[PDB]
Design a protein around this nucleic acid. Sequence first.
RNA 1: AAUUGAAGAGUUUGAUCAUGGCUCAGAUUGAACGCUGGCGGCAGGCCUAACACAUGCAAGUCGAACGGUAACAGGAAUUCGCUGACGAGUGGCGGACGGGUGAGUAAUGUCUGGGAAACUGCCUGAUGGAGGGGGAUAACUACUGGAAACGGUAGCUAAUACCGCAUAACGUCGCAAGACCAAAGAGGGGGCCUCUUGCCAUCGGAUGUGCCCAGAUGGGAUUAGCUAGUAGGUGGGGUAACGGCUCACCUAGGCGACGAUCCCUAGCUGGUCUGAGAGGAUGACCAGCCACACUGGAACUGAGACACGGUCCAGACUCCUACGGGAGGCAGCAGUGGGGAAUAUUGCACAAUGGGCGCAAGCCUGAUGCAGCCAUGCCGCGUGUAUGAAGAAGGCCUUCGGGUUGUAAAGUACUUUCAGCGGGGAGGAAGGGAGUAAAGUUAAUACCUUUGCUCAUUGACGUUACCCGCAGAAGAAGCACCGGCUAACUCCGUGCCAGCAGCCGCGGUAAUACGGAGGGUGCAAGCGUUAAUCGGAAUUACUGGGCGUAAAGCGCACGCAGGCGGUUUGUUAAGUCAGAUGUGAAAUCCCCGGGCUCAACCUGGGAACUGCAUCUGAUACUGGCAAGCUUGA
Lengths: 79, 86, 205, 81
Amino acid sequence: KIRTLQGRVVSDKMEKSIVVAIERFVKHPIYGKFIKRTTKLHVHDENNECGIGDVVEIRECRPLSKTKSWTLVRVVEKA
Amino acid sequence: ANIKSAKKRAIQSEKARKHNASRRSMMRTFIKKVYAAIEAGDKAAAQKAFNEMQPIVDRQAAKGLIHKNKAARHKANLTAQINKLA
Amino acid sequence: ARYLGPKLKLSRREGTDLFLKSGVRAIDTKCKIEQAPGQHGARKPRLSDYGVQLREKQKVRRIYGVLERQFRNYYKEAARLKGNTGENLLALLEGRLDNVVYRMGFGATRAEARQLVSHKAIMVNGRVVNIASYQVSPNDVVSIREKAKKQSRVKAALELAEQREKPTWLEVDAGKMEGTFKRKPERSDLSADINEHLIVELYSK
Amino acid sequence: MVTIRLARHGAKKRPFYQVVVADSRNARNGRFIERVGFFNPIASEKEEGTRLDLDRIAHWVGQGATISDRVAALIKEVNKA
RNA sequence: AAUUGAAGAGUUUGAUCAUGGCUCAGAUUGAACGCUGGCGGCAGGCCUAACACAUGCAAGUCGAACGGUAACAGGAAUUCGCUGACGAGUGGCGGACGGGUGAGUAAUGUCUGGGAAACUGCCUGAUGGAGGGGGAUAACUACUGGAAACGGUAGCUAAUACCGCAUAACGUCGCAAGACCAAAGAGGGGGCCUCUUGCCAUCGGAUGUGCCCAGAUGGGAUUAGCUAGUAGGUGGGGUAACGGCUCACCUAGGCGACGAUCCCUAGCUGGUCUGAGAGGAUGACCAGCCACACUGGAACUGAGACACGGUCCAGACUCCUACGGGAGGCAGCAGUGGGGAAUAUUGCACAAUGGGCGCAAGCCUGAUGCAGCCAUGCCGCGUGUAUGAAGAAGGCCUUCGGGUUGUAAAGUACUUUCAGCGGGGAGGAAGGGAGUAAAGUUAAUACCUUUGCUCAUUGACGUUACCCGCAGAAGAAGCACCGGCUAACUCCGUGCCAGCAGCCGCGGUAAUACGGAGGGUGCAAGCGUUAAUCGGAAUUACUGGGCGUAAAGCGCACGCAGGCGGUUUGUUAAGUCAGAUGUGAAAUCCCCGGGCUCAACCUGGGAACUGCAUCUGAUACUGGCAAGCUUGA
Ligand SMILES: [K+]
Ligand SMILES: [K+]
Ligand SMILES: [K+]
Ligand SMILES: [K+]
Ligand SMILES: [K+]
Ligand SMILES: [K+]
Ligand SMILES: [K+]
Ligand SMILES: [K+]
Ligand SMILES: [K+]
Ligand SMILES: [K+]
Ligand SMILES: [K+]
Ligand SMILES: [K+]
Ligand SMILES: [K+]
Ligand SMILES: [K+]
Ligand SMILES: [K+]
Ligand SMILES: [K+]
Ligand SMILES: [Mg+2]
Ligand SMILES: [Mg+2]
Ligand SMILES: [Mg+2]
Ligand SMILES: [Mg+2]
Ligand SMILES: [Mg+2]
Ligand SMILES: [Mg+2]
Ligand SMILES: [Mg+2]
Ligand SMILES: [Mg+2]
Ligand SMILES: [Mg+2]
Ligand SMILES: [Mg+2]
Ligand SMILES: [Mg+2]
Ligand SMILES: [Mg+2]
Ligand SMILES: [Mg+2]
Ligand SMILES: [Mg+2]
Ligand SMILES: [Mg+2]
Ligand SMILES: [Mg+2]
Ligand SMILES: [Mg+2]
Ligand SMILES: [Mg+2]
Ligand SMILES: [Mg+2]
Ligand SMILES: [Mg+2]
Ligand SMILES: [Mg+2]
Ligand SMILES: [Mg+2]
Ligand SMILES: [Mg+2]
Ligand SMILES: [Mg+2]
Ligand SMILES: [Mg+2]
Ligand SMILES: [Mg+2]
Ligand SMILES: [Mg+2]
Ligand SMILES: [Mg+2]
Ligand SMILES: [Mg+2]
Ligand SMILES: [Mg+2]
Ligand SMILES: [Mg+2]
Ligand SMILES: [Mg+2]
Ligand SMILES: [Mg+2]
Ligand SMILES: [Mg+2]
Ligand SMILES: [Mg+2]
């Protein structure tokens, strides 16, 4: 298989690129409470199919621009 | 230089620089002719200039002045531009 | 690195006999044993709880002749070893070579047995050992060297050892002047006037 | 290149060598790839003074690893049991 | 077997309970200072000025690549490179390692775990090649410039230096057809052969390096907005390689309260100190990573450097000069000056381990192995043992009886570690060199290779460890404290003075608190003081605290983000749980052992590294999705 993250599209205003927010759920190292953390990745979106809100599906690839190193696999859910 | 072998290395590297510089200039001159012919949109001449460039970049790559990957890049980039000249 | 002063002032401060003399006389025939030393020695000490812990530690130290840095290291090892820390600390002091040599009878006191060890007159399993703090293992054979078998103090020391209770974890042959260390002495084989739990608590203060 | 040599440890006047596989450029007691045995030159009798993993040594030699002269001698005495 | 682990006290009041700060007992250190000081072992030693540096040394090697002959040594007769060899020169390889430092760096780096678009000397495997030519150049010779550094002109010469040509496919470009690219010899022996070694191409391995991503890694909001190659796209260029890496054009984006930007501080980690733990503090030595090399900038050569003991430019300093011009960079080792409370010798040796070059012998190696200096730390040992009442003298105290110092001393018996003297004497040595005989090779009993045997040899440490002998208790004890916390009390002196002090406090003419003394207590080759960290401090409280009146509920609301979510079924498997696999460097810590006479120290094997990722399962609980229910609204 291939490692794969899944997140939600928060920006699609670039040509062939999207910003995807990935949510993680981790235990706080001191206080033990489970908190939500977010990471925003720049993702390559050929065909420009994704819209702001869709739940997508991304994988890691070679660098494609200064900030892009991830590429869109599929759309899991459309907004 | 303070060390005897450092002195000789300086003399040797300077001699190698002049030798390398003339060959590098020579190779670049031949590559420029292909780009100049492509500019003029002359496929006949562009294909000609490509043909004497090709043994030049290959021999220089074997002699260690450029890398094989660089020689391959020039040949690929120029071939791709020559074939679109039709 | 060794206490070199009067020996009975120690036993007088601790209010008991520390076996610091050979035993040819009675500790009361050489000193005022029940009186602490000094000008104010006749006063009645109101020992705090710390003072009672301290005096118990100084007693065990003064019996075996160990200084504080070495004794603190015995305690650290006793606490590290599995089992009852207080008993582990007594077993480590009873394993010392200079103590084992004295309990075997080769020395009149622990100081004399230490001089015999220091002056290269003792062997362990057949090798000269002049380290007073050497730890004797079970089944080890301690013996007197040949050039020291003729010393007059070793027989004077062997004639005072039967005047005392025979240690049952050893096995001496006064003839060949050699003994075997069969096992570590249990807590029961050791004196009952030593309250080692006071020492363990002192080192948690 | 990759070599198989002795790293000097132990104490003063009482060396104790570890047999290591290492890039030869690295310092004697520095970065190494894999430890494959030891060698105690002042070992007492009845004490193991030399142990080598000859299957790991043979694995690295098959990948081009050279061998120092002292480790070569140690391999011989070990094979000559 | 490897989680045996947790102490309080003083001080606010006339007294009390609470609250609350302050202070103390502990452990620790790259320590410093004061007093004192016997020996050994193992370690440690510029924390400040990344200040400036005299002198010596820290990188060379190869004649088996080459022309050669300055030696000196032979062979030949002042002559001959003829040989062993070898100065200078060409060429190869090394000089990018090893060693130093922590200035910069707050993520560009580091740590953990992943990843794709790459190169990689020496080493290693495979398959093929290694044909035939050419033009130079140093050295050298002649003349010549300059004070020097450093050059100029002419002529000659060699190669594994350099360049064509040939050869050209599991290689490069291309859909294809096709087109195109390499190379070097040297050495030993032999009735040109043979062996050894090197050269070239391609494909692998191994090692090293470059690059990408995610999470982690200081403080500040009395820094809230930042950014135009900026964010993305297309095309060209560029790199070993992906990429705004770069350029042109298009789009108008990208980052930020999950803290951007700005400011201050800082090398990161394994670990270390402390702590019952959770934490807190910290990053010296040792090992991994990074960065830097007088300051700023740049590239060249090269497999690899934008290069500590290389090059070029600029700058500040030092120096030389004939005034035109030149030289240098200890944060390598040692050392000097300076700064500082404070940190060592201008040592020996390549014998061992390792590195460079060499077929090797060997040469080089301030790496390293050792020695010197310093109680800086840890650990071990000694400074005597037994006897000895006259309870002597002398001191101190005394109600004058005595008490104490005190078995202490003297005396009398003994031992002799260590130091001193003399004698013996391991181990770190593996090897390499000569011989041999056998086997492998070859046309060859030759050479070479391999494996045995034989013979002589290699230790800086070093007067080694260690053992034996001689002599005589002979050479060897100090420092702080004694009102309470806190173990240990008297006298004399002083009289709110002199002084002590961590705190409570002490000192005013009967001071157990100042100073001396006698006595005592605690540690002991050390003991005190100061600095600094954690502890005690549940006194930032996750474990583990508070808010009516002690400090503390916003004047009251509404409400976005955020946190939290009644009940039932199904589904999902993110959280969670179980198991597996990979990784979590070694050292350190811990457990069981082993070796130094013991210990410190060294070391074998385990455990641990409480994490991350992947895979396979579990489905109660939490989350998501779907459908409800009515008790909250
Ligand atoms: K050279
Ligand atoms: K008070
Ligand atoms: K209090
Ligand atoms: K090089
Ligand atoms: K730094
Ligand atoms: K050729
Ligand atoms: K850019
Ligand atoms: K682009
Ligand atoms: K830490
Ligand atoms: K710099
Ligand atoms: K270096
Ligand atoms: K050496
Ligand atoms: K007297
Ligand atoms: K008297
Ligand atoms: K008076
Ligand atoms: K709490
Ligand atoms: Mg792009
Ligand atoms: Mg391109
Ligand atoms: Mg000591
Ligand atoms: Mg410094
Ligand atoms: Mg020469
Ligand atoms: Mg060549
Ligand atoms: Mg050709
Ligand atoms: Mg830190
Ligand atoms: Mg990039
Ligand atoms: Mg581009
Ligand atoms: Mg700094
Ligand atoms: Mg605590
Ligand atoms: Mg280059
Ligand atoms: Mg350099
Ligand atoms: Mg230098
Ligand atoms: Mg220096
Ligand atoms: Mg000074
Ligand atoms: Mg030299
Ligand atoms: Mg020897
Ligand atoms: Mg008291
Ligand atoms: Mg008075
Ligand atoms: Mg006083
Ligand atoms: Mg706390
Ligand atoms: Mg409170
Ligand atoms: Mg009030
Ligand atoms: Mg209030
Ligand atoms: Mg209110
Ligand atoms: Mg409300
Ligand atoms: Mg619920
Ligand atoms: Mg799950
Ligand atoms: Mg480890
Ligand atoms: Mg042992
Ligand atoms: Mg271990
Ligand atoms: Mg569920
Ligand atoms: Mg549910």
